[PDB]
Amino acid sequence: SALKISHQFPGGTIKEGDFRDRLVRNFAAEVEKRSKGAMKFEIYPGSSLMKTNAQFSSMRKGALDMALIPLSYAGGEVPELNIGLMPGLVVSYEQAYSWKTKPVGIELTRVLQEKGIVLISWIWQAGGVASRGKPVVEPEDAKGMKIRGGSREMDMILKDAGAAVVSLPSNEIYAAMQTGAMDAAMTSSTSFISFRLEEVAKALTTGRTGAYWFMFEPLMMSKAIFDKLPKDQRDMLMTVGAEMEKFALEAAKKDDIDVAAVYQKAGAKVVDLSDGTIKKWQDIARKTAWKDYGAKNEGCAKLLALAQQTL
Numbered sequence: 001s002a003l004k005i006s007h008q009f010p011g012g013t014i015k016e017g018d019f020r021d022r023l024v025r026n027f028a029a030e031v032e033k034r035s036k037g038a039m040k041f042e043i044y045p046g047s048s049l050m051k052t053n054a055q056f057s058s059m060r061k062g063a064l065d066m067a068l069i070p071l072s073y074a075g076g077e078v079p080e081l082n083i084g085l086m087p088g089l090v091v092s093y094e095q096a097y098s099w100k101t102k103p104v105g106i107e108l109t110r111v112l113q114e115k116g117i118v119l120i121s122w123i124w125q126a127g128g129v130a131s132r133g134k135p136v137v138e139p140e141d142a143k144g145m146k147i148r149g150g151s152r153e154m155d156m157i158l159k160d161a162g163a164a165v166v167s168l169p170s171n172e173i174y175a176a177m178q179t180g181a182m183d184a185a186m187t188s189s190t191s192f193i194s195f196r197l198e199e200v201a202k203a204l205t206t207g208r209t210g211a212y213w214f215m216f217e218p219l220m221m222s223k224a225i226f227d228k229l230p231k232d233q234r235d236m237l238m239t240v241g242a243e244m245e246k247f248a249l250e251a252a253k254k255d256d257i258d259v260a261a262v263y264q265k266a267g268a269k270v271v272d273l274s275d276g277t278i279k280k281w282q283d284i285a286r287k288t289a290w291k292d293y294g295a296k297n298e299g300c301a302k303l304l305a306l307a308q309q310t311l
Contacts, residue, residue: 011045
């Protein structure tokens with residue numbers, strides 16, 4: 001009877017923890033209240049219900065009700081979704097959130113619908129780089145290193161910079177860094193904190209003065225499940241879903257700053273990015289990743305063109 005919400009991030013409470021976990025708990029509490037109990041939820045944090053990379057497909061097939069997942073993890077199955085992490089196309093939170101109802105966001109929403117997924121909450125997150133050695137700041141700093149970029153397109157950028165790449169969901173970063181299976185890892189500010197990567201890295205490059213890495217990590221629902229609910233319940237999910245976006249923006253921005261103090265206190269070298277450095281990474285994107293993405297299929301070509309209209 002309860003609707004399940006699955007995600008890969010640590011569990012906590014509404015008041016304290018990884019904001020993505022907080023957000024789904026807030027979402028559930030408000031929908032329950034407003035629906036006067038017609039809908040109830042159960043939260044499965046930390047991949048406790050199923051593996052990270054099984055969630056998206058499970059929603060498509062109607063076997064999982066809801067999940068909060070980095071969207072581009074599904075880019076292997078639906079190439080259009082690789083736009084969820086591709087530097088240069090998203091340059092700021094304001095621009096990223098403005099996508100939602102601009103042509104690019106409507107298009108992305110409709111692509112997801114055709115694949116059996118409804119977008120409940122837009123969530124964008126700036127990132128950075130934790131390194132087992134020297135800070136990774138400039139693209140040239142990546143040369144010769146093994147780095148987890150986080151998506152196909154971040155990884156193509158890293159290859160152009162001369163890094164080797166490692167692919168894994170972010171809940172698997174800690175173990176890989178600890179054993180020296182990689183040299184550095186990119187992820188969100190929030191994940192740098194909630195996966196405690198300060199324990200396994202000596203340096204952090206932050207997004208305090210800007211970032212090139214912005215990942216889309218929306219709350220999603222199975223369309224099949226969603227569609228079978230009464231209209232008023234569908235609309236309440238969509239209403240509360242939209243309301244969570246303000247929380248997501250504030251929480252991400254707070255973690256973008258707080259992560260610096262966490263790593264500093266742990267004894268890590270902590271550095272920020274200049275606008276020029278950010279541009280270097282974005283320029284590499286325009287010449288490598290953008291081509292890879294846009295030429296993949298007609299849907300990617302369209303999304304890329306529509307995303308470019310927002311720059």
